[PDB]
Amino acid sequence: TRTVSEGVAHIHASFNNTIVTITDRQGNALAWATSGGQGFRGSRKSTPFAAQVAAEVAGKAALDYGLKNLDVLVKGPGPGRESAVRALGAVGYKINSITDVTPIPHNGCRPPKKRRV
Amino acid sequence: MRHYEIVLLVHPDQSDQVVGMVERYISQIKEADGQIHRLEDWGRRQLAYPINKIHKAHYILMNVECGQSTLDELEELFRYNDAIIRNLIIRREHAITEESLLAK
Amino acid sequence: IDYKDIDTLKQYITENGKIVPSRITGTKARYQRQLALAIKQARYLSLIPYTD
Amino acid sequence: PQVKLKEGEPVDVAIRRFKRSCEKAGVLADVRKREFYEKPTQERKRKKAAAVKRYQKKLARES
Amino acid sequence: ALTNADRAEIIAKFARAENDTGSPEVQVALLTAQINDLQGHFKAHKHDHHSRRGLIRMVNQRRKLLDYLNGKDHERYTALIGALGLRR
RNA sequence: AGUAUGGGAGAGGAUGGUAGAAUUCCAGGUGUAGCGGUGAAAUGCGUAGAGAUCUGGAGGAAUACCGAUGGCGAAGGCAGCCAUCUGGCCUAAUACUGACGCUGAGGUACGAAAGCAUGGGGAGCAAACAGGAUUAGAUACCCUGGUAGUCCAUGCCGUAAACGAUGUCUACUAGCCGUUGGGGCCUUUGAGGCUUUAGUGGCGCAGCUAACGCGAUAAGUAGACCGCCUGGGGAGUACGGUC
Numbered sequence: 264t265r266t267v268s269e270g271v272a273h274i275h276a277s278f279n280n281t282i283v284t285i286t287d288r289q290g291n292a293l294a295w296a297t298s299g300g301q302g303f304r305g306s307r308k309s310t311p312f313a314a315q316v317a318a319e320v321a322g323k324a325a326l327d328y329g330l331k332n333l334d335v336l337v338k339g340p341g342p343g344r345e346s347a348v349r350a351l352g353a354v355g356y357k358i359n360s361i362t363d364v365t366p367i368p369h370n371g372c373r374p375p376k377k378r379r380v
Numbered sequence: 381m382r383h384y385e386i387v388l389l390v391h392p393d394q395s396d397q398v399v400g401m402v403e404r405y406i407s408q409i410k411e412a413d414g415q416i417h418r419l420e421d422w423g424r425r426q427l428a429y430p431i432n433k434i435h436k437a438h439y440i441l442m443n444v445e446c447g448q449s450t451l452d453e454l455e456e457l458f459r460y461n462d463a464i465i466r467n468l469i470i471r472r473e474h475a476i477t478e479e480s481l482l483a484k
Numbered sequence: 485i486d487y488k489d490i491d492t493l494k495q496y497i498t499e500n501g502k503i504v505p506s507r508i509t510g511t512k513a514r515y516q517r518q519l520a521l522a523i524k525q526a527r528y529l530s531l532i533p534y535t536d
Numbered sequence: 537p538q539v540k541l542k543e544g545e546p547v548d549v550a551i552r553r554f555k556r557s558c559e560k561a562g563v564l565a566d567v568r569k570r571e572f573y574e575k576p577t578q579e580r581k582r583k584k585a586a587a588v589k590r591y592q593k594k595l596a597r598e599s
Numbered sequence: 600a601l602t603n604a605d606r607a608e609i610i611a612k613f614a615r616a617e618n619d620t621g622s623p624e625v626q627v628a629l630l631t632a633q634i635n636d637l638q639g640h641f642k643a644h645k646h647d648h649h650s651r652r653g654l655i656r657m658v659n660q661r662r663k664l665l666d667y668l669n670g671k672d673h674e675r676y677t678a679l680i681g682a683l684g685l686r687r
Numbered sequence: 688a689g690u691a692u693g694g695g696a697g698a699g700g701a702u703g704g705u706a707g708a709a710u711u712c713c714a715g716g717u718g719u720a721g722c723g724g725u726g727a728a729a730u731g732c733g734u735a736g737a738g739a740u741c742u743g744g745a746g747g748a749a750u751a752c753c754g755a756u757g758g759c760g761a762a763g764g765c766a767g768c769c770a771u772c773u774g775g776c777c778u779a780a781u782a783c784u785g786a787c788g789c790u791g792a793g794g795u796a797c798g799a800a801a802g803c804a805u806g807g808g809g810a811g812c813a814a815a816c817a818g819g820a821u822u823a824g825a826u827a828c829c830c831u832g833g834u835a836g837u838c839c840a841u842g843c844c845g846u847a848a849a850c851g852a853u854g855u856c857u858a859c860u861a862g863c864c865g866u867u868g869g870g871g872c873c874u875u876u877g878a879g880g881c882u883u884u885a886g887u888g889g890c891g892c893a894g895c896u897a898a899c900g901c902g903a904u905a906a907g908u909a910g911a912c913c914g915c916c917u918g919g920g921g922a923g924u925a926c927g928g929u930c
């Protein structure tokens with residue numbers, strides 16, 4: 264029902280999974296997709312293929328709101344980081360800019376122990 | 381006595397009363413004895429990042445030469461004055477009178 | 485260097501706001517130390533951004 | 537960061553520019569570093585090894 | 600914290616000869632004044648071991664200088680200890 | 688060997704204040720099928736609305752970039768910024784005391800982390816513990832949670848591969864290349880080139896060494912004092928004593 268022309272895509276790329284969510288400015292959510300919910304369950308989840316699958320699904324879901332110019336914010340490591348933006352651009356959005364918003368502590372909390380594997 | 385440099389950020393809304401507060405500070409310093417070596421008002425500035433949910437700040441600079449008691453008094457005055465956010469007090473040797481950059 | 489010389493302070497800061505290493509610029513050791521102190525003072529005084 | 541698109545910039549070229557900017561920034565390096573906690577002794581060991589290696593590199597280049 | 604004026608006053612009071620700044624009497628007077636002054640600081644900063652090391656260094660130098668003066672002449676040592684209010 | 692006066696660099700020590708990033712938790716806005724994790728799984732979390740995104744709050748701990756074969760400290764060890772108190776070191780010219788020195792059995796002071804006593808605090812991490820995997824077995828390595836502890840105040844404990852595995856002080860014996868804090872001289876195109884001093888590194892002659900190697904920061908050539916050793920186990924153990 265509600266129509267918004269401007270939107271923002273958040274891409275939570277990580278070692279195990281990638282999550283795509285479309286939010287109108289002020290951060291209210293419209294649509295979202297994940298790799299795990301689109302097959303590729305297991306080691307396949309982290310591949311960029313699942314990332315682009317999720318990105319296209321989220322974009323197609325979000326087209327209903329009639330938004331054509333999109334801002335992109337990226338945080339975290341992991342494959343599929345660029346596949347998501349490629350898929351979003353392919354869907355037809357106008358990507359205004361891509362920025363890295365991954366958090367960085369200035370020596371805060373103690374990280375977990377190293378794994379003896 | 382020693383030499384001190386004071387930078388004060390004042391809330392933009394209460395920028396009208398800045399002349400009065402600084403005048404009171406100078407009067408107190410002179411009453412103690414002291415020496416006012418430098419004084420400027422940089423005006424209001426756009427903050428690099430928000431401080432206490434505010435985006436603008438009035439800026440005042442002073443070089444004074446006073447004693448420990450006067451310094452301590454200035455300290456709690458700045459602490460308790462709500463108009464003053466973000467005060468800073470640096471120690472210096474010698475008095476610098478030359479006009480500062482960023483004056484206007 | 486003083487915290488009030490914002491132009492030179494920015495001349496040694498990267499776009500993200502991080503301080504540029506001395507090796508890249510050729511600055512001397514003591515000059516680099518005073519530069520870092522001045523940049524930190526300016527960051528406190530909200531004359532230059534901490535990050536971003 | 538803050539890679540604003542031009543009027544006709546292709547998405548692939550924009551992504552390449554974003555990759556280059558991120559690589560120059562070194563953001564991924566900190567995230568990798570903080571994944572696990574490393575002992576102070578190991579940190580000093582790594583720094584000393586790096587010091588030796590770069591001194592040897594400088595000597596080799598000078599030679 | 601002693602000032603230049605205070606140190607000059609001590610030097611003038613205990614100087615045997617004009618411009619005398621290295622005599623045992625002057626050295627011991629200065630060290631005694633410094634040691635007495637630092638007691639107030641060490642009353643409020645009892646866990647300042649790094650500074651207490653220097654305080655002990657001053658104490659040891661004063662002991663050595665007093666022993667040397669006593670060895671060379673007893674009258675000067677007795678007068679110095681009487682003036683500076685030191686047991687030994 | 689020491690003293691007075693002018694300057695310099697420094698995460699040297701104690702007390703208090705304060706800034707920004709981040710994790711956790713608590714509410715609310717949007718939104719609805721997963722999230723988390725592994726080599727692969729599973730435990731666990733979530734339709735009583737999780738994860739993601741936005742806003743507002745609570746609290747604890749540590750200070751990205753600078754950062755360096757860099758700096759300071761007797762050793763242990765010291766990192767955001769500001770104020771107060773405070774120890775040492777470096778450097779220059781004058782002016783003083785006149786061997787006032789070196790070492791040190793006993794003795795005494797300080798002394799990582801863990802641990803102990805009293806009171807407080809507790810975000811993250813995490814001995815013990817619980818469950819899930821792997822295995823013939825799994826008291827483990829991997830995963831999910833998690834207590835003491837790690838934090839503050841006042842005391843105790845005296846131990847580490849507390850290592851350069853190299854006790855302190857002193858004089859002398861080719862050279863070459865870096866770097867940190869000072870002093871001196873000479874050029875100019877505004878920063879450089881030579882010296883010298885005190886630290887900190889890389890090669891290397893002679894000399895030494897079983898060899899590896901050390902080589903003005905000696906493990907070379909000499910002097911002063913102290914501590915230590917006498918085949919491997921039994922054993923840094925028993926008995927007695929002190930704490």
Ligand SMILES: [Mg+2]
Nearest residue numbers: 375376378830
């Ligand atoms: Mg884990």
Ligand SMILES: [Mg+2]
Nearest residue numbers: 701702839840
């Ligand atoms: Mg305390």
Ligand SMILES: [Mg+2]
Nearest residue numbers: 791792793794
């Ligand atoms: Mg002994």
Ligand SMILES: [Mg+2]
Nearest residue numbers: 797798843845
């Ligand atoms: Mg003790």
Ligand SMILES: [Mg+2]
Nearest residue numbers: 846847849923
């Ligand atoms: Mg032992």
Ligand SMILES: [Mg+2]
Nearest residue numbers: 763799849850
């Ligand atoms: Mg050690």
Ligand SMILES: [Mg+2]
Nearest residue numbers: 848849850852
């Ligand atoms: Mg040993």
Ligand SMILES: [Mg+2]
Nearest residue numbers: 922923924925
């Ligand atoms: Mg025993």
